[PDB]
Amino acid sequence: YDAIPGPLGPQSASLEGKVALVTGAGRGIGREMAMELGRRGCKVIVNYANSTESAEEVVAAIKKNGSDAACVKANVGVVEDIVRMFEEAVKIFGKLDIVCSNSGVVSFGHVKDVTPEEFDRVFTINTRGQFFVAREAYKHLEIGGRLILMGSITGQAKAVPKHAVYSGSKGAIETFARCMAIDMADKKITVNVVAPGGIKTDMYHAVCREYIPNGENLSNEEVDEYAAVQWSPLRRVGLPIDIARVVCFLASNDGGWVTGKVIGIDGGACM
Amino acid sequence: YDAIPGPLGPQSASLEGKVALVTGAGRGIGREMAMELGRRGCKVIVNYANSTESAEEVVAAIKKNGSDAACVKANVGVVEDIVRMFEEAVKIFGKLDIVCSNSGVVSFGHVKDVTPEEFDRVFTINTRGQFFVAREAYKHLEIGGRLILMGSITGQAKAVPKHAVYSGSKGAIETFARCMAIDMADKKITVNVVAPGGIKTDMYHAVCREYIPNGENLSNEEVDEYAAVQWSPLRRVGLPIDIARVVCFLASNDGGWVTGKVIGIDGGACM
Amino acid sequence: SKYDAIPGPLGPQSASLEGKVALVTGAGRGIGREMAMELGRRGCKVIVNYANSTESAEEVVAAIKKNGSDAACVKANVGVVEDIVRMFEEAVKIFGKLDIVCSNSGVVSFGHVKDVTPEEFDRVFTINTRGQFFVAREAYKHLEIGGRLILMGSITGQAKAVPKHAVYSGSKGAIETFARCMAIDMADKKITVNVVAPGGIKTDMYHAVCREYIPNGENLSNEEVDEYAAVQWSPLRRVGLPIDIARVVCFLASNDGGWVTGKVIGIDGGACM
Amino acid sequence: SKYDAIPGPLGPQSASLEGKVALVTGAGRGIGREMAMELGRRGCKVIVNYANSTESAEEVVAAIKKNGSDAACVKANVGVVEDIVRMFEEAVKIFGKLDIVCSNSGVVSFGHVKDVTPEEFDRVFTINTRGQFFVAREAYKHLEIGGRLILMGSITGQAKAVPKHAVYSGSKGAIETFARCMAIDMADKKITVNVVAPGGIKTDMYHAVCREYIPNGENLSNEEVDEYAAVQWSPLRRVGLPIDIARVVCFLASNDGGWVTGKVIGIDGGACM
Ligand SMILES: NC(=O)C1=CN([C@@H]2O[C@H](COP(=O)(O)OP(=O)(O)OC[C@H]3O[C@@H](n4cnc5c(N)ncnc54)[C@H](OP(=O)(O)O)[C@@H]3O)[C@@H](O)[C@H]2O)C=CC1
Ligand SMILES: NC(=O)C1=CN([C@@H]2O[C@H](COP(=O)(O)OP(=O)(O)OC[C@H]3O[C@@H](n4cnc5c(N)ncnc54)[C@H](OP(=O)(O)O)[C@@H]3O)[C@@H](O)[C@H]2O)C=CC1
Ligand SMILES: NC(=O)C1=CN([C@@H]2O[C@H](COP(=O)(O)OP(=O)(O)OC[C@H]3O[C@@H](n4cnc5c(N)ncnc54)[C@H](OP(=O)(O)O)[C@@H]3O)[C@@H](O)[C@H]2O)C=CC1
Ligand SMILES: NC(=O)C1=CN([C@@H]2O[C@H](COP(=O)(O)OP(=O)(O)OC[C@H]3O[C@@H](n4cnc5c(N)ncnc54)[C@H](OP(=O)(O)O)[C@@H]3O)[C@@H](O)[C@H]2O)C=CC1
Ligand SMILES: O=C1C=Cc2c1cccc2[N+](=O)[O-]
Ligand SMILES: O=C1C=Cc2c1cccc2[N+](=O)[O-]
Ligand SMILES: O=C1C=Cc2c1cccc2[N+](=O)[O-]
Ligand SMILES: O=C1C=Cc2c1cccc2[N+](=O)[O-]
């Protein structure tokens, strides 16, 4: 029990020669996860559901930076797509070391107005989808593998109104991490959840003002000032790279004793 | 802002003349919630899905104790049943002051073995069902009403293996409480979640040993000793009345400033 | 099967504090004063502790008697452990036993971390943390088997947006950990230990430092401060009052609070701070 | 748009601690010793603080130099604020500036709440809580703009099953609250403040009190204690080691930890205590 796990020194942070799969990697946070993982030495499998051209673009940019990459189409709202995506994936590079469950959709609405169709729309992707991506990940990962789930500050937030559906779908993920950390440990796989605050993406551009009291008439410039001054003492807006960096840490040997945890990445936000 | 809300003294705990609806009140914890609420002066609407005779029995026992009661059939896994149950309910006693979302099912299994049918079975009732019971509750409750959701120690537990599905369905409820507490406050309604530890019910009798390492061969007598010594410094097993009492507190004026909270009722358990 | 025994009475009698004996530290003013009053109204005999407010303490005692219960005050400063030990010895001499102990006494503090002096750090921790811990030690020793111990915390123990508040916030955060740890030990005498964590509550403490929690609030009128507190800190849209806390303390002190131990109960109207 | 600027370098250089200067309190032994060593291997110049272990401190310094970085030890007891102030003044004189501060120094304690003396309560809080707070005050004043401050917490701050541990547990729990509150203040200099909360880790502290966390463990052999720790406290089935913590400290100290502030990072292998 005194044997050192992995190398001492800077090498413990290396992702050289690893093979990673990221869901929803054609845009936003997922895209940056794939890019950054590629820069650190990973062969990356870029999953997408709709954005086909964007996906082929991420694959090209990763090769340009010195790492191999490939894309695979699959909709997480369909367990069968998830099952085959993983079967294709292991055929591409021969193994799977890291899995980043990133795909997700957003939603806003007073509880009194939520329809069962909208509730199901969100949960099938944000919760049920991540669960099944995790199931297949367990079966296919190398012993000593990694699984990083995507949460949100909304799982614990206390002041965002009309956001129960989305918030609840993300809150469930924090519990999965703890419970899956136990089961998946029989394969020495760690499981954690990243919980970012607002990050500038297409998602952010579409609903940012929903998190801002009386912000319907704010200019894009004003929205970012609010985000910078209101959601962080460090006084700046969050960016995809802010998350990609933490994902890489968890994915490396440096995160070997971190499992069953929820890592908040929001610049000290209070929401 | 200095005006005292409600009466000073012991009367602030009274549930006299209130009308409450409890889902899954024909058995277990729900049954005790209805009984106790009835003893404190509430007219109770006993919902059930399958247990018809048990339901009529709870209604009779409540009348016997001095309060009116009535039963209504509805399956929470069907939004339409929930919609009509509430419409019937307000016709029975003329109004609705307290709603206890209690109905739930249990499930155990290693992540690698979970099927989409089982995952959906559990979430449709424990999560989607509670969400829609809450939606209808909001629409029908009196201003100053109450809504108590049913969680579990499993939402935060860290040592129960093969329990991700159930645990996650309950963990989502803690997030709903915070988010719904905001929306429902426009009607001065409070929303909280009760998170019990093991409580002796039919549920407990069926899966208690799943929470006990190497407990497959334990006698019922031995299971209770383990539960008493292992899950509580107070050295006893949890009982439905332990939960019913806290529900009554939240339902009264005494709980007027308690909203958006998760109240753990497990006798100081560590699971 | 012995495990099937119902603990306490079924029905509304489970909420009763009739004939109980309770001690409240710092009961001459604020939240502590209202705890004693409300506990008094539910039928408890109350020992009103105070460190400085002598005349106010005597007034609380007289008011409780007028409401139909018996009370008496005892002077003690929680900064001196010896004062606490003798306070409990005098307590049991007055009413014969002790059923409920409410550790309420506390002081507030604001200041950028760079400006905190060791004297100010010690000023606060000795009362808010060290004081509560020793009041808890004595409460254990003297409480009836099946008694109650409620510690005073704050929203600041978990708050994320209050600047220049590490000393006070840290002194309260430690209490949440004392509850979980003390709930284990004190259970050998069937005593339950919980922490109440209020949001802002209108007392003397609030009037002195409320604006410190409000960004650019230095020039706000009292009327504007309450509006901010009411609208910003609660979806229910109102300010917190001593009775909001007193009511939850009574629940915890009753048989209704029997299975609730080692917990933190936030009572802030759904605040986000 | 100024908000679109990427903070720091893309790729693996973001994980670099090359040419950084770090100070670690209690770096002559245990977790503190391994933090200094590992930080040294990633390219930092290290100031090795110690209060008593002089010879051990000198050994850590020599080992870091042998691994290719520069180091120096400074004697200081965190119980004396004046020793901390002068320690930081001597620190900047040695390497010219300070980029990373690791508040690691601490003592353990066990005892039923009924048996705790005020002298023992003060012994622990002065080092574990008051000490860390004043090491943090000085770290703020002397740190480079964009620096780092990592406080040492423990699993005990939130643990639910360790009996006779309210003093120590409470002293660590307060740190989690210091992180959230100090992250706000120290951000005016772009410094991030986080808390690492380890589970059991094999050090001298562990060897002295490990059995106290194990029910009926008083007669366990060291071999049996490790097996219990490995199987009971982790699904991964192994014991915690100083390197497991040192690695996470380095992450937080790097540009990779830039958006992580005001957080508690548990590093216990998925333990439940
Ligand atoms: N941005 C923010 O402020 C925050 C975001 N998050 C979470 O981070 C993740 C990414 O967010 P962000 O990048 O902003 O989101 P975007 O809206 O930019 O899209 C993110 C990704 O989700 C993918 N996706 C959507 N539906 C599916 C599906 N059915 N199957 C597979 N993939 C799908 C999209 O791919 P496609 O184009 O093919 O549809 C896209 O690649 C989400 O889970 C989000 O909830 C958490 C906190 C904050
Ligand atoms: N007992 C324990 O250890 C704990 C239980 N809980 C939760 O407390 C609640 C009650 O548990 P417990 O009393 O032990 O459970 P039981 O298994 O005894 O049954 C509880 C109730 O759930 C109802 N129910 C099931 N399905 C539906 C449905 N589709 N629609 C409406 N009602 C339904 C049942 O009614 P019917 O007979 O009509 O099917 C029954 O009334 C649950 O939500 C449970 O998860 C939380 C923590 C611990
Ligand atoms: N007001 C608020 O918004 C909130 C308050 N709290 C906590 O609630 C408690 C009381 O608050 P509040 O009523 O507003 O406070 P006040 O400032 O109005 O008075 C608090 C009490 O503390 C007592 N006290 C002070 N020092 C000592 C001492 N050395 N020994 C014994 N008793 C002492 C005072 O008694 P004396 O007159 O004799 O000095 C007084 O009775 C505190 O612990 C506080 O931190 C928590 C959250 C919010
Ligand atoms: N070991 C474990 O399992 C865990 C430990 N921790 C925490 O990690 C930290 C270190 O633990 P660990 O390495 O095991 O401890 P050890 O007992 O092995 O040594 C701890 C260090 O504290 C230092 N120290 C003690 N008093 C002072 C003082 N008055 N001033 C300055 N430095 C002082 C010691 O230095 P010196 O030789 O000069 O006295 C020593 O370097 C502690 O804060 C501890 O509470 C948290 C979780 C788990
Ligand atoms: O989870 C989130 C998705 C979007 C978002 C979230 C948290 C905070 C802010 C914003 N935003 O879009 O502005
Ligand atoms: O949520 C729960 C449902 C059953 C249960 C739960 C928690 C702890 C124990 C047990 N049990 O059945 O034994
Ligand atoms: O702990 C507290 C003491 C005062 C206070 C606290 C929390 C929130 C508000 C206020 N106030 O005084 O306004
Ligand atoms: O904080 C701690 C100090 C020692 C320890 C702690 C947590 C868990 C285990 C052990 N141990 O010494 O075995």
PDB file of C-alpha atoms in Angstrom, chain A residues 1-13 32 36 39-40 181-183 185-186 188-190 197-200 221 224-225 228-229 231-239 241-243 245-246 248-249 253-269, chain D residues 1-15 34 38 41-43 183-184 187-188 190-192 199-202 223 226-227 230-231 234-241 243-245 247-248 250-251 255-256 258-271:
ATOM      1  CA  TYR A   1       0.000   0.000   0.000  1.00  0.00           C
ATOM      2  CA  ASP A   2       3.083   2.201  -0.022  1.00  0.00           C
ATOM      3  CA  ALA A   3       3.794   1.653  -3.765  1.00  0.00           C
ATOM      4  CA  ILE A   4       3.672   4.922  -5.650  1.00  0.00           C
ATOM      5  CA  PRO A   5       0.880   5.040  -8.257  1.00  0.00           C
ATOM      6  CA  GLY A   6       2.325   6.410 -11.484  1.00  0.00           C
ATOM      7  CA  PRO A   7       5.471   8.571 -12.042  1.00  0.00           C
ATOM      8  CA  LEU A   8       6.738  11.288  -9.740  1.00  0.00           C
ATOM      9  CA  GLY A   9       7.163  14.719 -11.306  1.00  0.00           C
ATOM     10  CA  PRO A  10       5.595  16.574 -14.312  1.00  0.00           C
ATOM     11  CA  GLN A  11       5.010  13.393 -16.326  1.00  0.00           C
ATOM     12  CA  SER A  12       2.031  12.555 -14.093  1.00  0.00           C
ATOM     13  CA  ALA A  13       0.078  15.258 -15.973  1.00  0.00           C
ATOM     14  CA  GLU A  32     -12.615  22.640 -26.702  1.00  0.00           C
ATOM     15  CA  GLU A  36      -7.155  20.567 -25.663  1.00  0.00           C
ATOM     16  CA  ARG A  39      -2.871  19.213 -27.785  1.00  0.00           C
ATOM     17  CA  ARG A  40      -1.849  17.142 -24.740  1.00  0.00           C
ATOM     18  CA  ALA A 181     -17.655   5.901  -8.630  1.00  0.00           C
ATOM     19  CA  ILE A 182     -18.359   2.825  -6.473  1.00  0.00           C
ATOM     20  CA  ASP A 183     -19.440   0.425  -9.250  1.00  0.00           C
ATOM     21  CA  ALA A 185     -13.991   1.195  -9.373  1.00  0.00           C
ATOM     22  CA  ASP A 186     -13.974  -2.563  -9.972  1.00  0.00           C
ATOM     23  CA  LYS A 188     -10.050   1.111 -11.471  1.00  0.00           C
ATOM     24  CA  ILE A 189     -12.000   3.749 -13.348  1.00  0.00           C
ATOM     25  CA  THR A 190     -12.580   7.132 -11.704  1.00  0.00           C
ATOM     26  CA  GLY A 197     -20.659  28.377 -14.300  1.00  0.00           C
ATOM     27  CA  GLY A 198     -21.668  30.384 -17.384  1.00  0.00           C
ATOM     28  CA  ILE A 199     -19.269  29.653 -20.289  1.00  0.00           C
ATOM     29  CA  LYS A 200     -19.388  31.555 -23.633  1.00  0.00           C
ATOM     30  CA  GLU A 221     -21.553  43.709 -24.623  1.00  0.00           C
ATOM     31  CA  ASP A 224     -20.648  39.952 -20.676  1.00  0.00           C
ATOM     32  CA  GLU A 225     -19.973  42.836 -18.255  1.00  0.00           C
ATOM     33  CA  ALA A 228     -17.870  39.261 -15.454  1.00  0.00           C
ATOM     34  CA  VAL A 229     -18.702  41.541 -12.541  1.00  0.00           C
ATOM     35  CA  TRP A 231     -20.662  35.975 -11.363  1.00  0.00           C
ATOM     36  CA  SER A 232     -16.959  36.235 -10.468  1.00  0.00           C
ATOM     37  CA  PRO A 233     -14.674  38.121  -8.046  1.00  0.00           C
ATOM     38  CA  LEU A 234     -11.916  37.587 -10.665  1.00  0.00           C
ATOM     39  CA  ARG A 235     -13.975  39.864 -12.941  1.00  0.00           C
ATOM     40  CA  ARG A 236     -14.051  38.041 -16.284  1.00  0.00           C
ATOM     41  CA  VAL A 237     -16.307  35.696 -18.277  1.00  0.00           C
ATOM     42  CA  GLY A 238     -15.846  31.933 -18.348  1.00  0.00           C
ATOM     43  CA  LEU A 239     -14.515  30.274 -21.487  1.00  0.00           C
ATOM     44  CA  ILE A 241     -10.682  26.430 -22.210  1.00  0.00           C
ATOM     45  CA  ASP A 242     -11.348  27.057 -18.485  1.00  0.00           C
ATOM     46  CA  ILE A 243     -13.268  23.740 -18.439  1.00  0.00           C
ATOM     47  CA  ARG A 245      -8.085  22.348 -18.614  1.00  0.00           C
ATOM     48  CA  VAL A 246      -9.802  20.816 -15.559  1.00  0.00           C
ATOM     49  CA  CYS A 248      -7.471  17.177 -18.713  1.00  0.00           C
ATOM     50  CA  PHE A 249      -6.303  17.183 -15.069  1.00  0.00           C
ATOM     51  CA  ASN A 253      -2.694  10.426 -13.357  1.00  0.00           C
ATOM     52  CA  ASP A 254      -2.749  13.651 -11.293  1.00  0.00           C
ATOM     53  CA  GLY A 255      -6.444  12.933 -10.654  1.00  0.00           C
ATOM     54  CA  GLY A 256      -5.946   9.324  -9.564  1.00  0.00           C
ATOM     55  CA  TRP A 257      -7.251   9.839  -6.020  1.00  0.00           C
ATOM     56  CA  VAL A 258     -10.096  12.142  -7.105  1.00  0.00           C
ATOM     57  CA  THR A 259     -13.276  10.081  -7.651  1.00  0.00           C
ATOM     58  CA  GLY A 260     -16.931  10.491  -6.697  1.00  0.00           C
ATOM     59  CA  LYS A 261     -16.440  14.248  -6.669  1.00  0.00           C
ATOM     60  CA  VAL A 262     -18.156  17.321  -8.060  1.00  0.00           C
ATOM     61  CA  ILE A 263     -15.550  19.925  -9.248  1.00  0.00           C
ATOM     62  CA  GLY A 264     -17.045  23.425  -9.530  1.00  0.00           C
ATOM     63  CA  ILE A 265     -15.452  25.617 -12.252  1.00  0.00           C
ATOM     64  CA  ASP A 266     -17.151  28.990 -12.173  1.00  0.00           C
ATOM     65  CA  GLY A 267     -14.583  31.504 -10.910  1.00  0.00           C
ATOM     66  CA  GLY A 268     -16.098  31.735  -7.393  1.00  0.00           C
ATOM     67  CA  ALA A 269     -19.651  32.412  -8.614  1.00  0.00           C
TER      68      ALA A 269
ATOM     69  CA  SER D   1     -14.489  40.994 -26.568  1.00  0.00           C
ATOM     70  CA  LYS D   2     -11.639  41.728 -24.164  1.00  0.00           C
ATOM     71  CA  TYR D   3     -13.431  38.885 -22.415  1.00  0.00           C
ATOM     72  CA  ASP D   4     -12.569  36.637 -25.347  1.00  0.00           C
ATOM     73  CA  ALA D   5      -8.884  36.695 -24.515  1.00  0.00           C
ATOM     74  CA  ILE D   6      -7.570  33.211 -23.664  1.00  0.00           C
ATOM     75  CA  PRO D   7      -6.073  33.245 -20.177  1.00  0.00           C
ATOM     76  CA  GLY D   8      -2.628  31.669 -20.397  1.00  0.00           C
ATOM     77  CA  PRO D   9      -1.183  29.185 -22.959  1.00  0.00           C
ATOM     78  CA  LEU D  10      -3.118  26.506 -24.841  1.00  0.00           C
ATOM     79  CA  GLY D  11      -1.877  22.945 -24.593  1.00  0.00           C
ATOM     80  CA  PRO D  12       0.284  21.234 -21.914  1.00  0.00           C
ATOM     81  CA  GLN D  13       2.289  24.317 -20.956  1.00  0.00           C
ATOM     82  CA  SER D  14      -0.710  25.420 -18.936  1.00  0.00           C
ATOM     83  CA  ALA D  15       0.228  22.680 -16.429  1.00  0.00           C
ATOM     84  CA  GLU D  34       5.829  15.739  -0.425  1.00  0.00           C
ATOM     85  CA  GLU D  38       6.721  17.452  -6.075  1.00  0.00           C
ATOM     86  CA  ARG D  41      10.161  18.443  -9.464  1.00  0.00           C
ATOM     87  CA  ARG D  42       7.775  20.579 -11.537  1.00  0.00           C
ATOM     88  CA  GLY D  43      10.302  23.433 -11.485  1.00  0.00           C
ATOM     89  CA  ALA D 183     -11.595  33.674  -2.481  1.00  0.00           C
ATOM     90  CA  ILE D 184     -13.716  36.835  -2.650  1.00  0.00           C
ATOM     91  CA  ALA D 187      -9.448  38.029  -5.939  1.00  0.00           C
ATOM     92  CA  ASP D 188      -8.617  41.755  -6.001  1.00  0.00           C
ATOM     93  CA  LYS D 190      -6.298  37.686  -8.961  1.00  0.00           C
ATOM     94  CA  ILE D 191      -5.196  35.112  -6.395  1.00  0.00           C
ATOM     95  CA  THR D 192      -7.237  31.872  -6.224  1.00  0.00           C
ATOM     96  CA  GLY D 199      -9.001  11.199   3.420  1.00  0.00           C
ATOM     97  CA  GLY D 200      -6.569   9.066   5.408  1.00  0.00           C
ATOM     98  CA  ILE D 201      -2.985   9.443   4.140  1.00  0.00           C
ATOM     99  CA  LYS D 202       0.019   7.420   5.420  1.00  0.00           C
ATOM    100  CA  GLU D 223      -0.812  -4.586   8.389  1.00  0.00           C
ATOM    101  CA  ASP D 226      -3.859  -0.618   6.119  1.00  0.00           C
ATOM    102  CA  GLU D 227      -6.138  -3.418   4.869  1.00  0.00           C
ATOM    103  CA  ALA D 230      -7.747   0.174   1.793  1.00  0.00           C
ATOM    104  CA  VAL D 231     -10.961  -1.832   1.711  1.00  0.00           C
ATOM    105  CA  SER D 234     -12.031   3.256  -0.859  1.00  0.00           C
ATOM    106  CA  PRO D 235     -13.821   1.412  -3.682  1.00  0.00           C
ATOM    107  CA  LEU D 236     -10.440   1.580  -5.475  1.00  0.00           C
ATOM    108  CA  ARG D 237      -9.108  -0.600  -2.651  1.00  0.00           C
ATOM    109  CA  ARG D 238      -5.835   1.087  -1.615  1.00  0.00           C
ATOM    110  CA  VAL D 239      -4.453   3.437   1.034  1.00  0.00           C
ATOM    111  CA  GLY D 240      -3.888   7.187   0.456  1.00  0.00           C
ATOM    112  CA  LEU D 241      -0.321   8.520   0.084  1.00  0.00           C
ATOM    113  CA  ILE D 243       1.782  12.024  -3.564  1.00  0.00           C
ATOM    114  CA  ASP D 244      -1.998  11.686  -4.136  1.00  0.00           C
ATOM    115  CA  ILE D 245      -2.415  15.087  -2.484  1.00  0.00           C
ATOM    116  CA  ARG D 247      -0.414  16.104  -7.431  1.00  0.00           C
ATOM    117  CA  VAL D 248      -3.716  17.904  -6.897  1.00  0.00           C
ATOM    118  CA  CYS D 250       0.266  21.223  -8.273  1.00  0.00           C
ATOM    119  CA  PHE D 251      -2.798  21.308 -10.538  1.00  0.00           C
ATOM    120  CA  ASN D 255      -2.724  27.956 -14.850  1.00  0.00           C
ATOM    121  CA  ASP D 256      -4.975  24.856 -15.222  1.00  0.00           C
ATOM    122  CA  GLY D 258      -7.267  29.330 -13.018  1.00  0.00           C
ATOM    123  CA  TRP D 259     -11.106  29.133 -12.996  1.00  0.00           C
ATOM    124  CA  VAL D 260     -11.200  26.976  -9.826  1.00  0.00           C
ATOM    125  CA  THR D 261     -11.563  29.308  -6.808  1.00  0.00           C
ATOM    126  CA  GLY D 262     -13.528  29.160  -3.531  1.00  0.00           C
ATOM    127  CA  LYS D 263     -13.723  25.372  -3.720  1.00  0.00           C
ATOM    128  CA  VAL D 264     -13.226  22.300  -1.564  1.00  0.00           C
ATOM    129  CA  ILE D 265     -11.504  19.430  -3.398  1.00  0.00           C
ATOM    130  CA  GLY D 266     -11.910  16.108  -1.642  1.00  0.00           C
ATOM    131  CA  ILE D 267      -9.076  13.672  -2.331  1.00  0.00           C
ATOM    132  CA  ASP D 268      -9.921  10.470  -0.457  1.00  0.00           C
ATOM    133  CA  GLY D 269     -10.429   7.823  -3.148  1.00  0.00           C
ATOM    134  CA  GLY D 270     -14.212   7.997  -2.860  1.00  0.00           C
ATOM    135  CA  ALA D 271     -14.303   7.455   0.907  1.00  0.00           C
TER     136      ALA D 271
END
